[PDB]
Coordinates of C-alpha atoms and ligand atoms in Angstrom, one line a residue:
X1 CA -9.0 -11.7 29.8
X2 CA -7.5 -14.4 27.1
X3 CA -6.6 -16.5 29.8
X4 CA -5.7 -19.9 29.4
X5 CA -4.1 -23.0 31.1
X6 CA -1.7 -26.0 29.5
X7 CA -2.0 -28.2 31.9
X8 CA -0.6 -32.1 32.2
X9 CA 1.9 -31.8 29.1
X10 CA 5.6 -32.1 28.8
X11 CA 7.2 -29.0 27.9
X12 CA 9.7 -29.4 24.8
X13 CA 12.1 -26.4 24.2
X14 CA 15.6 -26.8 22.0
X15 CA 18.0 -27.2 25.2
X16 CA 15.5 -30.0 26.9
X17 CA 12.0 -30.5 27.9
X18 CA 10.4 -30.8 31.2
X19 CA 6.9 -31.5 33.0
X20 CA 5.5 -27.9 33.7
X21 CA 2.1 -26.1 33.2
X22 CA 2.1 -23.4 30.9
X23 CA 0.2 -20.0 31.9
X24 CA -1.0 -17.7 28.7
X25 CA -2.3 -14.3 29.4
X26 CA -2.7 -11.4 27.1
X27 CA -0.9 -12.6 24.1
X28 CA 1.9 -13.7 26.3
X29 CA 3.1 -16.7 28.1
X30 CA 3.0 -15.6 31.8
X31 CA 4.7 -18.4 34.0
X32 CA 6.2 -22.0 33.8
X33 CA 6.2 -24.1 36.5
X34 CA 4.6 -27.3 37.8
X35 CA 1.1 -27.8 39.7
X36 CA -0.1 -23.8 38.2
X37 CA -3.5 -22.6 39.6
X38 CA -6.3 -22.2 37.7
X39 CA -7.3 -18.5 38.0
X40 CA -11.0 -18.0 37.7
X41 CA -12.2 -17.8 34.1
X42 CA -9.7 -18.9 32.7
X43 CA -9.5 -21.8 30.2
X44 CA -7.9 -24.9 30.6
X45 CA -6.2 -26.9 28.1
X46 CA -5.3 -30.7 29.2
X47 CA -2.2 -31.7 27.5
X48 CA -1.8 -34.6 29.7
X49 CA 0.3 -37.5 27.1
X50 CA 0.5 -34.6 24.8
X51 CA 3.9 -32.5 24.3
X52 CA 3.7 -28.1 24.4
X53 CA 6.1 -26.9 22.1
X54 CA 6.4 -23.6 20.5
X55 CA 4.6 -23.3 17.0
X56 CA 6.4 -24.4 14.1
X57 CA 7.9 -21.3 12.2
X58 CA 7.6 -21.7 8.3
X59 CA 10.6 -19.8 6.8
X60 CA 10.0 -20.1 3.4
X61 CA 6.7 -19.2 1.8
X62 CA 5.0 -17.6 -1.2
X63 CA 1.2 -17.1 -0.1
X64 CA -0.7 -15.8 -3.3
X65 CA 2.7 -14.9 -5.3
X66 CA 1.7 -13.8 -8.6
X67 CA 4.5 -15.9 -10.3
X68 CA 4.7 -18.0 -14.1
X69 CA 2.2 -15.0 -14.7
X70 CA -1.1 -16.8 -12.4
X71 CA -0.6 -16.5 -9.0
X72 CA -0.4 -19.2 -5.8
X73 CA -3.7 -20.7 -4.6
X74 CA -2.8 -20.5 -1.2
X75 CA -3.4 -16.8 -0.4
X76 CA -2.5 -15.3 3.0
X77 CA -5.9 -15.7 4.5
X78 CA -6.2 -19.8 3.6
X79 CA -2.1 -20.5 3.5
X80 CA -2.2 -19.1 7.5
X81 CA -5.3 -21.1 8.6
X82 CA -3.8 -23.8 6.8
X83 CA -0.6 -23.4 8.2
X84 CA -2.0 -23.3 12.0
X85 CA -4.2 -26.4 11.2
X86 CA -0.9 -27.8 10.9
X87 CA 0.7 -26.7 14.1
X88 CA 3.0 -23.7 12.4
X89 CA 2.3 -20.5 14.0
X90 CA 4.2 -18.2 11.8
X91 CA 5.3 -18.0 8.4
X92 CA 8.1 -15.6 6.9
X93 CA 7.4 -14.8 3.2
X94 CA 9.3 -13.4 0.4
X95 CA 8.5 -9.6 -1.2
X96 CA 8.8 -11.0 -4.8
X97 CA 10.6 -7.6 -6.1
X98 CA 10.4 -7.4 -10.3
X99 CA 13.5 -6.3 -11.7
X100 CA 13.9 -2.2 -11.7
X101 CA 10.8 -2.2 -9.4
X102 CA 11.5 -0.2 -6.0
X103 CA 12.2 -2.6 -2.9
X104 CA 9.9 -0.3 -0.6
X105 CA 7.2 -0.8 -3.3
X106 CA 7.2 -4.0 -3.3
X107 CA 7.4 -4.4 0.6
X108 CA 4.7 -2.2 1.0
X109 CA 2.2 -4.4 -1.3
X110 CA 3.1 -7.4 0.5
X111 CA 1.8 -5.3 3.9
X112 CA -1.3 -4.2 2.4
X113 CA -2.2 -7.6 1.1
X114 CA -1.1 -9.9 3.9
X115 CA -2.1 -7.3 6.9
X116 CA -6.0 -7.8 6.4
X117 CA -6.1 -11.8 5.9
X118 CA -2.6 -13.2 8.3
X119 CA -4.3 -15.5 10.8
X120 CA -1.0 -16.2 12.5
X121 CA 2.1 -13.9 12.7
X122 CA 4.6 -13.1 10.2
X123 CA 6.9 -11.3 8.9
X124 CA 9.0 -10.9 5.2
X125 CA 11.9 -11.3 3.6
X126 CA 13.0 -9.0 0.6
X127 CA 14.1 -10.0 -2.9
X128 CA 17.2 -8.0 -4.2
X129 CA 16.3 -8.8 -8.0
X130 CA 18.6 -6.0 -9.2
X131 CA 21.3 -3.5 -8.1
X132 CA 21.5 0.0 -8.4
X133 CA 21.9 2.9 -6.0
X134 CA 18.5 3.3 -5.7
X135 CA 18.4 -0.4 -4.4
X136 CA 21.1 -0.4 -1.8
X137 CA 19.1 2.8 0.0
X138 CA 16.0 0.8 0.1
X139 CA 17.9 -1.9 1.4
X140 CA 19.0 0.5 4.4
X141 CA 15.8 1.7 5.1
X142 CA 13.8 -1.8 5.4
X143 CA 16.3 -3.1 7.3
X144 CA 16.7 0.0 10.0
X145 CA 12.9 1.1 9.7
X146 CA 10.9 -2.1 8.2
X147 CA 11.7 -4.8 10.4
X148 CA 13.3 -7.0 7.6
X149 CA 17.0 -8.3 8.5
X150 CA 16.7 -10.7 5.5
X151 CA 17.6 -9.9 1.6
X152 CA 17.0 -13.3 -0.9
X153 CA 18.9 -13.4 -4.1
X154 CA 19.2 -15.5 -7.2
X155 CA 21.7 -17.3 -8.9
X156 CA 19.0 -18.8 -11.4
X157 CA 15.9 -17.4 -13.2
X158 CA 18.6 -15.8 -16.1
X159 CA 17.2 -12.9 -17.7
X160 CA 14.3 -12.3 -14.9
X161 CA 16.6 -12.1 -11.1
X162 CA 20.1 -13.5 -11.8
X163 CA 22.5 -11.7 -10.6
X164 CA 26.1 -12.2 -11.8
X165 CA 29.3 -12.6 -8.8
X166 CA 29.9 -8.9 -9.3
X167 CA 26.6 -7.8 -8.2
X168 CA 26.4 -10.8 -5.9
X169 CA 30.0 -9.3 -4.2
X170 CA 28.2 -5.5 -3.7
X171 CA 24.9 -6.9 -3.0
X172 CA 26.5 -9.5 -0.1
X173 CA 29.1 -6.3 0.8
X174 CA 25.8 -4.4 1.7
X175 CA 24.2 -6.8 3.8
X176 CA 26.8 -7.0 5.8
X177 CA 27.3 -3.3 6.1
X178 CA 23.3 -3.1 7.5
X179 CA 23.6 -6.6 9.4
X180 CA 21.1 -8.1 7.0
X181 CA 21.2 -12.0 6.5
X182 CA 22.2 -12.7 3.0
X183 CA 19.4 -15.7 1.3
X184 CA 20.5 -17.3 -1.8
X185 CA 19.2 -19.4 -4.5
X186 CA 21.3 -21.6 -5.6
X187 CA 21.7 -22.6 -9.3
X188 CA 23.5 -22.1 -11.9
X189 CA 21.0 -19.8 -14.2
X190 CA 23.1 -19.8 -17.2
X191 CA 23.0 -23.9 -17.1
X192 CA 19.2 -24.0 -16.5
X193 CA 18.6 -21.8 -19.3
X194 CA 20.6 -24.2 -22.2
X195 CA 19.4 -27.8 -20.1
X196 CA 16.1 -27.3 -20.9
X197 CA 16.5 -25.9 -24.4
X198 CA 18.5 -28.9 -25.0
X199 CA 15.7 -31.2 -23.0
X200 CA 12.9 -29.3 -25.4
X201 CA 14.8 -29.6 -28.6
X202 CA 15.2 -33.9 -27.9
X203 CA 11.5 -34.0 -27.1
X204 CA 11.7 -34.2 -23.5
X205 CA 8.6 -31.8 -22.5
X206 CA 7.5 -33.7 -19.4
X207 CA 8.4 -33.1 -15.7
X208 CA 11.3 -35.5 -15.9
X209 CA 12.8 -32.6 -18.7
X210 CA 12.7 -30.5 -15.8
X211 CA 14.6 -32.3 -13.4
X212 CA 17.3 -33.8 -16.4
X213 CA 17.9 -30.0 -17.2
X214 CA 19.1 -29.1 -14.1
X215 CA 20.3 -31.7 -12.0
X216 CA 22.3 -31.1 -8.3
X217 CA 25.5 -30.7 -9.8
X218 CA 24.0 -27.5 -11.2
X219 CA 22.6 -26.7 -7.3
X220 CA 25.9 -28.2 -5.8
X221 CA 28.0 -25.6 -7.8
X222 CA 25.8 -22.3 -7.1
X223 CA 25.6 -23.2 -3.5
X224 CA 29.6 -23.4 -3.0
X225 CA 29.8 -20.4 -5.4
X226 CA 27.4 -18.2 -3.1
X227 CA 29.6 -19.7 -0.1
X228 CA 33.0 -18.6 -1.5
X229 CA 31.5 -14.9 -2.0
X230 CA 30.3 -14.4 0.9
X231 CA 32.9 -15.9 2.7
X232 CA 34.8 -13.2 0.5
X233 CA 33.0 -10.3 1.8
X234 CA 32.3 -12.0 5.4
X235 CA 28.5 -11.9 5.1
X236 CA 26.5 -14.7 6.6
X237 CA 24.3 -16.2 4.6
X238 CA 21.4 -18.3 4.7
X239 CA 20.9 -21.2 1.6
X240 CA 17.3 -21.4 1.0
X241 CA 15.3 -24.8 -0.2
X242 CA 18.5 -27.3 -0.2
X243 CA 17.2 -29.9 -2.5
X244 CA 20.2 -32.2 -2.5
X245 CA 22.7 -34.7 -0.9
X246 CA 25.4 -33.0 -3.0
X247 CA 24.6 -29.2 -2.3
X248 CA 23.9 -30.3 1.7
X249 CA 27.5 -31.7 1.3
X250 CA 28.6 -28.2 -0.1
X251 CA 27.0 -26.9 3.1
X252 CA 28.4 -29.6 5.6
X253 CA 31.4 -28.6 4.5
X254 CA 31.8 -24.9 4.5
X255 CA 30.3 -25.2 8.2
X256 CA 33.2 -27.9 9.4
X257 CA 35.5 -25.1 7.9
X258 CA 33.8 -22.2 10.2
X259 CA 31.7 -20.6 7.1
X260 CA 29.0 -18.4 8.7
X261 CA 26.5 -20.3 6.1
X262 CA 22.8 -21.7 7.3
X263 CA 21.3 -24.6 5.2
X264 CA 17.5 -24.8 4.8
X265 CA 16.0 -28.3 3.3
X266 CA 12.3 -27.9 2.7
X267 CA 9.3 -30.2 3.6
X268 CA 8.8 -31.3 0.1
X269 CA 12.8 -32.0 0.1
X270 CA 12.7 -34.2 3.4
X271 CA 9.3 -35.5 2.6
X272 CA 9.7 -37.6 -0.7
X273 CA 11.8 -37.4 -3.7
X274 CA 12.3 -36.5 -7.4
X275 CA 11.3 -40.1 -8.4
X276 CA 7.3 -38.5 -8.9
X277 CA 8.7 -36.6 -12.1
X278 CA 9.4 -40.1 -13.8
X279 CA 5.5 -41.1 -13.1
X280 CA 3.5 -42.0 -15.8
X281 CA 0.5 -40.2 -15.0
X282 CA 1.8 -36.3 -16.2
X283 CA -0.4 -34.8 -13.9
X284 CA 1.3 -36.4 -10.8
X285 CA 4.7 -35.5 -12.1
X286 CA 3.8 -31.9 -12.6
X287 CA 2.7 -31.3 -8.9
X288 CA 6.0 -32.2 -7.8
X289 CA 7.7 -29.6 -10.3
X290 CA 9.7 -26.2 -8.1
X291 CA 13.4 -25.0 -8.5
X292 CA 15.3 -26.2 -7.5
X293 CA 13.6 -29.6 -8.4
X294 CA 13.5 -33.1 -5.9
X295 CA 16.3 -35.5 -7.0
X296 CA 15.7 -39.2 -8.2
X297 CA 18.1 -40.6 -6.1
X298 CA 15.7 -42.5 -3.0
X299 CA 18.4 -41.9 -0.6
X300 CA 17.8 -38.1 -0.2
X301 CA 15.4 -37.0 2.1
X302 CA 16.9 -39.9 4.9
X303 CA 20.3 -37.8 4.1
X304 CA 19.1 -34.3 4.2
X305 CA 16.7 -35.5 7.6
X306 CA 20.5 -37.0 8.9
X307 CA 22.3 -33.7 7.9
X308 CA 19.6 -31.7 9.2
X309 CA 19.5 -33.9 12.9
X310 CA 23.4 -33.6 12.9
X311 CA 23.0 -30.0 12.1
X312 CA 24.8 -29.5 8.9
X313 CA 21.6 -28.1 8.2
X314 CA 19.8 -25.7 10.6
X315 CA 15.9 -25.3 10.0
X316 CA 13.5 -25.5 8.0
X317 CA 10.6 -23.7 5.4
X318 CA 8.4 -25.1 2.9
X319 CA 8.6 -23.0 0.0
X320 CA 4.6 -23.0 -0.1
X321 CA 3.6 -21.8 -3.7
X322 CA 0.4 -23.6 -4.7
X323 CA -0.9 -24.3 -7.9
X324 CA -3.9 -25.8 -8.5
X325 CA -4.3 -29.2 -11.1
X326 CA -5.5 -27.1 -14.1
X327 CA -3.0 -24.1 -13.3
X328 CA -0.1 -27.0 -13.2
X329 CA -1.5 -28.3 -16.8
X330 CA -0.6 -24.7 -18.4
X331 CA 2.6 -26.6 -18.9
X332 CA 1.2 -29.7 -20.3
X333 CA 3.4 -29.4 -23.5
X334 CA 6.6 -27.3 -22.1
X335 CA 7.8 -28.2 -18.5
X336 CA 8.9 -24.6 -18.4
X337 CA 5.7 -23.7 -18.6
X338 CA 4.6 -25.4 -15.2
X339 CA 4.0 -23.0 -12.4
X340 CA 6.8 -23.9 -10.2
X341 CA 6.0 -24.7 -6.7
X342 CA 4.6 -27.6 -4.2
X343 CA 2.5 -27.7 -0.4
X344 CA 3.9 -28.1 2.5
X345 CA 2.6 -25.1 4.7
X346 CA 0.0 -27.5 6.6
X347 CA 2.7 -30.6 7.0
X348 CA 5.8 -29.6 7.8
X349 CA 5.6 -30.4 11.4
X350 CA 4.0 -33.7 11.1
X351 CA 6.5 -34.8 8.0
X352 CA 9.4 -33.6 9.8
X353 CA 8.1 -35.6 13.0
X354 CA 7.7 -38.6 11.7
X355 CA 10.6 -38.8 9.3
X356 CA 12.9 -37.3 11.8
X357 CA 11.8 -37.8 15.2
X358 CA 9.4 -41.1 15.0
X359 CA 12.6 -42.7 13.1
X360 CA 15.0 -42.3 15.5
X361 CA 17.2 -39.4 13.4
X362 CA 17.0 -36.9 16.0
X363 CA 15.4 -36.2 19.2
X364 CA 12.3 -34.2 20.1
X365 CA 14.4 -31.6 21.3
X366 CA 16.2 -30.8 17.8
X367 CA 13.1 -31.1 16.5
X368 CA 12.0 -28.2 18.1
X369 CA 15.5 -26.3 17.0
X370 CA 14.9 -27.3 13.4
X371 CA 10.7 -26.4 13.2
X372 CA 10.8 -22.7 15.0
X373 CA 13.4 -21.9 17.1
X374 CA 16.6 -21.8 15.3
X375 CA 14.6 -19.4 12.6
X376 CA 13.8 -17.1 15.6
X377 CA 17.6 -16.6 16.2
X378 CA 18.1 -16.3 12.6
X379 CA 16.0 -13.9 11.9
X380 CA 16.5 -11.8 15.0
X381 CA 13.3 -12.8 17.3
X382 CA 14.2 -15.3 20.1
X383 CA 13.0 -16.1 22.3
X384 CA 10.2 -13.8 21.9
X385 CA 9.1 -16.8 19.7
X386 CA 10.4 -20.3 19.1
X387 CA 10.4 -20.9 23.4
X388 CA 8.2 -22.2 25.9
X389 CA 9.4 -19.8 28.6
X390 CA 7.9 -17.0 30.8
X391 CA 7.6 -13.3 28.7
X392 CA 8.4 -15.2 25.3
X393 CA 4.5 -15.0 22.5
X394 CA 1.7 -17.4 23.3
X395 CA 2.2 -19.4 20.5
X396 CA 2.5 -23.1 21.6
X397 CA 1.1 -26.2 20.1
X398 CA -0.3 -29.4 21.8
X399 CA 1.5 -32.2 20.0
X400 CA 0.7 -35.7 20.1
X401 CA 3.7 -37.7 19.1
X402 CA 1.5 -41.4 19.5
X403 CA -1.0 -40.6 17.3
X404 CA -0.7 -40.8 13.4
X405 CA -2.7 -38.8 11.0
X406 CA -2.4 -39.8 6.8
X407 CA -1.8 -36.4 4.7
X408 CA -4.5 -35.6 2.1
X409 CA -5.6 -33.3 -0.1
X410 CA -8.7 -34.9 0.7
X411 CA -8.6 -33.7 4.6
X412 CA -5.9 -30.6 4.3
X413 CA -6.7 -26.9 4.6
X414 CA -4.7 -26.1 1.8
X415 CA -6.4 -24.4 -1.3
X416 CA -4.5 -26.6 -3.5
X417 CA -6.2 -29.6 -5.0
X418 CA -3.8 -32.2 -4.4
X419 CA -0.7 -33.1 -1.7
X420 CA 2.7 -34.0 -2.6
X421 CA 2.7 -36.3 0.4
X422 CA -1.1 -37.7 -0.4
X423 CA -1.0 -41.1 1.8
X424 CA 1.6 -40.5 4.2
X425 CA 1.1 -42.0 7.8
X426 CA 2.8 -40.0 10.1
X427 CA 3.3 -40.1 13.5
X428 CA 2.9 -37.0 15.6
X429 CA 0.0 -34.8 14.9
X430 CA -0.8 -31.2 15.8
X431 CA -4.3 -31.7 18.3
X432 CA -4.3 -28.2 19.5
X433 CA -3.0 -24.5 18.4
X434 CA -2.7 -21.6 20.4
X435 CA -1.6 -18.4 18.3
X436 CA -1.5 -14.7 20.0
X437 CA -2.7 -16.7 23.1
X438 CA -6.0 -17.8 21.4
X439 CA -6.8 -21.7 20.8
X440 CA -7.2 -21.2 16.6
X441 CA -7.5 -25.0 16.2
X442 CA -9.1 -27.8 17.9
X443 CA -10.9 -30.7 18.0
X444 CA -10.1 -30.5 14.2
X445 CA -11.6 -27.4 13.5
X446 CA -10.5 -23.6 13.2
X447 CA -11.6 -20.7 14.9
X448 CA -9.3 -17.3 13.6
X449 CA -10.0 -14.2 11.8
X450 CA -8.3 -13.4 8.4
X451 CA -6.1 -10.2 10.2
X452 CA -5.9 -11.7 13.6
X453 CA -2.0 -12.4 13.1
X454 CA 0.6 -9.8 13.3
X455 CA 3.2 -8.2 11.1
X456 CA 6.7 -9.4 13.4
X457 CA 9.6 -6.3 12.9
X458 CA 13.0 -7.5 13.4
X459 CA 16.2 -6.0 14.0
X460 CA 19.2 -6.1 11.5
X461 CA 22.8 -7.9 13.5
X462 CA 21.0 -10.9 14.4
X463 CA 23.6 -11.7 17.4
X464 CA 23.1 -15.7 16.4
X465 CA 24.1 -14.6 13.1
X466 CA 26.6 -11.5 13.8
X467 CA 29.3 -12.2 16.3
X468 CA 31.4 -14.0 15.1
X469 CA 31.5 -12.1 11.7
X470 CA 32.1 -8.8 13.7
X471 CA 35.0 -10.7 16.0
X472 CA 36.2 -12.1 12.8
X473 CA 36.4 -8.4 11.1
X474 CA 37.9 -6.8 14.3
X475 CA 40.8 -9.5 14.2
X476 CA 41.4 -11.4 10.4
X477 CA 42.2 -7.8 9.5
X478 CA 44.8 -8.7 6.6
X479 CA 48.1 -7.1 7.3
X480 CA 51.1 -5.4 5.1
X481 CA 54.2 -7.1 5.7
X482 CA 56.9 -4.3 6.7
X483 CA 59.5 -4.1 4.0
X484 CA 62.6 -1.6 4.0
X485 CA 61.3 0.9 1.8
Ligands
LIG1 ZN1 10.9 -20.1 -2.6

């Protein structure tokens, strides 16, 4: 039948968290209540001193992009079991689309590669790399027929995805007009591109080059720029990777004000810092390298785990895009040559616990907001996911908040040959994981099937996201003031 039993535990949702058995049947999560019977055959899980909370939800990945021209180690098949070893259920990744290549394309090579090897759901987000007619019709279609109510863009990457405010306007006009979520990177791409000619003409070819050439002022400026537009056009949007205390600000801000803007810090961003860039061993610095990059100052991943409990900032991804030690090297004379892109997949829930949770920043409950159900109303699928509740997927994780576990690439799933959070003790550590309403991990080992996991289609006008910009277009109409002719 698939039948299985959580008993003993502590149910944690976002609103509070109760002792309750949880019933899985068929994929599904069939009743919540205390003292459940065991019906015969069925498999019981004892989560007695153990918490059962949804999976985590990764909203920010790049499983085998093909990227700095080489391609991320972690591939859908590994990134997934990975992922699930680390008590995240699904992952939401981004349809890289080259500039003047079709959207639809593009979306359907991400299907045909990630279909066959997922080993827990997912679903994708859709690059708008360029703007044309053909572009904004694709952009119809996969949001009314391809289940994708999320379009990213960039403000960086000059020359290769930029887009300029004009495009930006049209592009943000448009996914409002087919309820998509507007993403943004956040940079400024015309000071990137002359920081790190000026960093390579002084000499400055290391990591550190990269994080001098671009630091958050640079974030801190795109992010309120991509605010003010869409505020403009009144399309929500969604602020992907925030890297620093001055762009979270940016975001704090527009929020207090009533912008319909989400901020998303990263694990890498909440995990450590930029410090790593400065190390004197090159190779260490490099694995830390991404865009935007970690900032030196020590104080901000405490700050962005406070703005992220106080809910300045909403959820959270990892922007998993792996690169293996000698792929990371190909930039051992040009940190522009570095394949941008750290781990996290496998540790988000465990950094994010202990950081957040085991230091007394926020409470289990927001921890479960922040990990998988805020991106489930975000992206349109709560609480189908992202809920311990009856109807809502079997995809539920047996946490132990006790028990430590130290990160390393010398224990993780992950392809990638090293871990930007090698040594960490944290607190709270994923014992078992139940995906489609099969245990895929337990007793430290996996047991899943690359193709198991499922493709998730959403529907565009999120209502999280989309009612208050439709009240807000049905009465901050401007108006004419009636003059005598
Ligand atoms: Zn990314």
């Amino acid at each position: 039948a698939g039948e299985i039993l959580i008993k003993g535990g502590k149910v944690v949702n976002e609103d509070c968290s109760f002792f309750s058995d949880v019933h899985i049947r068929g994929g599904k999560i069939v009743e919540v209540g205390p003292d459940l019977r065991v019906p015969p055959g069925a498999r019981v899980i004892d989560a007695t001193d153990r918490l059962v909370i949804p999976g985590g939800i990764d909203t920010h990945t790049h499983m085998e992009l093909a990227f700095m021209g080489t391609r991320a180690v972690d591939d859908f098949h590994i990134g997934t079991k990975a992922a699930l070893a680390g008590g995240t259920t699904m992952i939401l990744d981004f349809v890289m689309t080259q500039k003047g290549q079709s959207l639809l394309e593009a979306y359907d090579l991400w299907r045909k590669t990630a279909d066959p090897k997922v080993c827990c759901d997912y679903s994708l987000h859709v690059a708008v790399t360029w703007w044309s007619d053909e572009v904004k019709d694709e952009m119809r279609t996969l949001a009314q027929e391809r289940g994708v109510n999320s379009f990213k863009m960039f403000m960086a990457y000059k020359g290769l995805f930029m887009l300029r405010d004009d495009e930006l306007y049209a592009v943000f006009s448009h996914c409002k007009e087919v309820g998509a979520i507007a993403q943004v990177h956040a940079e400024n791409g015309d000071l990137i591109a002359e920081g790190a000619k000026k960093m390579l003409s002084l000499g400055i070819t290391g990591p550190e080059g990269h994080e001098l050439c671009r630091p958050e002022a640079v974030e801190a400026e795109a992010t309120q720029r991509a605010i003010t537009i869409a505020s403009a056009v009144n399309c929500p949007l969604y602020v992907v990777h925030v890297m620093s205390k001055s762009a979270a600000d940016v975001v704090s801000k527009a929020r207090k004000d009533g912008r319909v803007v989400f901020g998303e810090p990263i694990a890498a961003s909440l995990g450590t810092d930029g410090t790593n860039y400065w190390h004197k061993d090159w190779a260490h610095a490099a694995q830390y390298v991404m865009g935007p990059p970690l900032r030196p100052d020590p104080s901000t991943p405490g700050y962005l785990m406070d703005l992220l409990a106080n809910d300045d900032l909403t959820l959270t991804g990892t922007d998993n895009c792996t690169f293996s030690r000698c792929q990371k090297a190909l930039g051992k004379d040009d940190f522009t040559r570095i394949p941008n892109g750290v781990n996290g997949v496998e540790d988000r829930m465990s950094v994010i616990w202990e950081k957040g949770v085991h230091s007394g920043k926020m409470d289990e409950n927001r921890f479960v907001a922040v990990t998988s159900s805020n991106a489930a109303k975000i992206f349109n699928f709560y609480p189908q996911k992202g809920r311990i509740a009856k109807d809502s997927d079997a995809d539920v994780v047996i946490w132990d908040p006790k028990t430590t576990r130290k990160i390393s690439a010398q224990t993780h799933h992950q392809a990638v040959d090293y871990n930007i959070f090698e040594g960490m003790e944290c607190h709270g550590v994923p014992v078992v994981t139940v995906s489609r309403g099969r245990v895929v991990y337990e007793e430290g080992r996996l047991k899943v099937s690359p193709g198991q996991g499922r493709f998730i289609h959403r529907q565009p006008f999120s209502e999280f996201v989309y009612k208050r910009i439709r009240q807000r277009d049905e009465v901050g109409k401007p108006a004419v003031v009636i003059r005598e002719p």
